[PDB]
Amino acid sequence: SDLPRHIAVLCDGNRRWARSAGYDDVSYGYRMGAAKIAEMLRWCHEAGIELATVYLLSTENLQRDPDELAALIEIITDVVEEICAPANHWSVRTVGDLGLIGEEPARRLRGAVESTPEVASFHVNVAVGYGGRREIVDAVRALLSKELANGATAEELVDAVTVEGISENLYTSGQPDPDLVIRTSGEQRLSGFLLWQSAYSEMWFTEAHWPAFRHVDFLRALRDYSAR
Amino acid sequence: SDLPRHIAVLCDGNRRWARSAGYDDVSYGYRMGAAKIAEMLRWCHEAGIELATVYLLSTENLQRDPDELAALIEIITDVVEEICAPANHWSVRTVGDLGLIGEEPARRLRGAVESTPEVASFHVNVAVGYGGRREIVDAVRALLSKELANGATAEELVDAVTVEGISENLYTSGQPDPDLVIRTSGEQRLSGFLLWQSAYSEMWFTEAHWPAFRHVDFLRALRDYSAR
Numbered sequence: 001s002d003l004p005r006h007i008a009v010l011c012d013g014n015r016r017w018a019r020s021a022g023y024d025d026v027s028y029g030y031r032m033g034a035a036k037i038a039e040m041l042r043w044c045h046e047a048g049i050e051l052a053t054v055y056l057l058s059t060e061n062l063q064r065d066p067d068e069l070a071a072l073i074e075i076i077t078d079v080v081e082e083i084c085a086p087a088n089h090w091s092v093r094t095v096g097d098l099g100l101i102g103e104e105p106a107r108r109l110r111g112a113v114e115s116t117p118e119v120a121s122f123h124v125n126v127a128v129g130y131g132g133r134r135e136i137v138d139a140v141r142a143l144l145s146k147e148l149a150n151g152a153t154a155e156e157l158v159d160a161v162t163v164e165g166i167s168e169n170l171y172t173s174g175q176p177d178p179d180l181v182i183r184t185s186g187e188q189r190l191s192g193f194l195l196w197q198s199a200y201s202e203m204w205f206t207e208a209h210w211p212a213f214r215h216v217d218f219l220r221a222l223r224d225y226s227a228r
Numbered sequence: 229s230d231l232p233r234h235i236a237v238l239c240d241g242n243r244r245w246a247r248s249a250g251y252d253d254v255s256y257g258y259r260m261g262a263a264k265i266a267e268m269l270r271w272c273h274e275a276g277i278e279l280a281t282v283y284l285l286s287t288e289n290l291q292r293d294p295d296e297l298a299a300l301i302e303i304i305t306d307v308v309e310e311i312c313a314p315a316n317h318w319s320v321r322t323v324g325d326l327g328l329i330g331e332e333p334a335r336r337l338r339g340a341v342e343s344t345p346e347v348a349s350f351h352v353n354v355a356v357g358y359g360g361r362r363e364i365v366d367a368v369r370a371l372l373s374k375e376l377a378n379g380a381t382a383e384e385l386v387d388a389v390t391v392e393g394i395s396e397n398l399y400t401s402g403q404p405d406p407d408l409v410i411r412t413s414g415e416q417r418l419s420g421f422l423l424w425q426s427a428y429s430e431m432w433f434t435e436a437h438w439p440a441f442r443h444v445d446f447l448r449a450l451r452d453y454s455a456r
C-alpha cells in the first residue's frame with residue numbers, strides 16, 4: 001500500500017563517479033555500481049518489495065567503444081550471475097535482447113537466469129540490450145504473429161492490436177507495472193526505460209551518482225513514495 | 229537561448245488550489261486554471277517556443293461527477309475557443325478523441341480548431357479525451373490499415389510495424405517530440421501524457437498548483453532546462 005510492489009532503477013553516473021574519484025579507467029565506476037546493484041536488491045527484498053527491475057544495459061550503451069563495452073558486458077554478466085546465486089532463491093527474468101551482447105555473455109546470462117526458480121517471494125528483472133520503443137514494437141510483432149498462427153486474416157490483424165494485447169506481449173508480461181522509478185545523477189528523464197509500463201509510475205530523483213547510492217537514499221525514496 | 233522546441237504542460241492542482249484558498253466550489257479552480265493556460269501560452273509564444281501541448285482532459289478525468297464534468301467541459305471549450313481566436317494567429321491541433329466529450333462540445337471544439345491556420349509561427353496542441361497507451365494502439369492500427377491498403381499480405385503485416393511507423397501515426401505526427409514536460413502540484417508522474425513521444429523528454433516539477441503558476445516559475449523552468 002504505502003510500499004511499492006515493483007521498483008525500477010536507472011543506474012546512471014558510473015563513469016562520472018569514476019572521474020570524480022580520479023580513476024582513469026571508468027570500469028572502476030561500473031564495478032562499484034555492480035556492488036550497489038547487489039546491495040539495492042538485498043534492500044528491496046528485505047523491505048518486502050515483490051519485484052525489482054534494474055537497468056543494466058541500454059541499446060544506447062551498445063554503441064560504445066568495443067573494448068570498454070566488452071569490459072562493461074563482463075561486469076554485467078558477473079552482476080547477473082551474482083543475482084542468480086542459489087542462496088538468494090530469487091526468481092530472475094531478462095528484459096531485453098541478448099542477441100545484442102555477444103554469444104558468450106548471452107549463454108552465461110541465460111544459463112544463470114534459467115537456473116533460478118520460477119516461483120519465489122522476490123523477483124528481479126535484469127534489463128540488458130533494452131529499449132522501450134523497441135520493446136513495444138516487438139510486443140506488437142509478437143501479438144500479430146500469434147494471431148496469424150491462429151488463422152487471423154489480414155483484416156483481422158488490423159483490428160487485433162489492443163492495450164491489453166500489447167501489455168501481455170512485453171518482456172514484463174504478467175508482472176505488475178513499476179510503482180516507483182528511481183533515477184540517479186540528477187538526471188530528470190525516463191529515457192524510454194519500461195516506457196509502456198511506467199506510464200503511471202511515481203518518479204524519484206537523487207543527485208548522487210549510482211555508485212554513490214546509499215541505503216539511506218533508498219530509505220528516502222520509500223519514505224517519499226509513502227508520503228505521496 | 230537554449231529553448232525547448234516543444235513544451236508540454238500537465239496542469240495539475242486546480243481543485244486542490246481552490247480548496248486551499250478557501251473556495252467551497254472547486255470548479256472555480258478550473259476557471260482560474262483556464263485563465264492561466266491562456267497566459268502560459270502567451271509566455272511560450274513570446275519566449276519563442278514553437279509548439280506547446282496542454283493537457284486539458286484525460287480519459288480518466290471523464291469519471292468525475294456530472295456537474296463538475298459539465299462545468300469542466302464548458303471551461304475547456306472556452307479555453308480552446310480563446311486559443312483559436314483569430315487575433316492570436318496560432319495553429320491549433322486536437323490531440324485525443326473528441327468522441328469522448330459529447331456531441332455539442334465536440335462540435336464547438338472542432339469548429340474552433342478547424343478555423344485556425346495550418347501555417348503559423350506558434351502552434352498549440354490541445355489534449356482532450358487523450359490516453360497515451362490508447363494513442364499508441366490507434367497509431368499501430370492506422371499504420372497497419374495503411375499497409376493493408378497498399379496491398380500487404382497478412383504475413384507481411386506481422387513485420388510491418390516499426391518505431392518510425394508508430395511515430396508517424398500518432399496525433400503528433402509531423403511534430404517534434406516534447407523537449408520539456410512541466411507538471412505542477414508536486415506530482416512526479418507523466419500519467420501516460422504523450423507517452424511515446426516523451427520517452428526522452430526533460431521533466432520539470434514545481435510544488436505550485438497550476439492556478440498559482442507564475443511567469444517567474446516559467447522562467448525557472450526554462451533556466452533549469454537550459455542548465456540540464
Ligand SMILES: CC(C)=CCC/C(C)=C/CC/C(C)=C/COP(=O)(O)OP(=O)(O)O
Nearest residue numbers: 238239240258261262283284286288289419
Ligand atoms: C481548464 C483546465 C485548467 C483544465 C485542466 C483540468 C484537468 C482535468 C487537468 C488534468 C491534467 C492531468 C495532470 C491529467 C492526468 O491525470 P490522470 O487522472 O489522467 O492520471 P493520474 O491519476 O495519474 O493523475
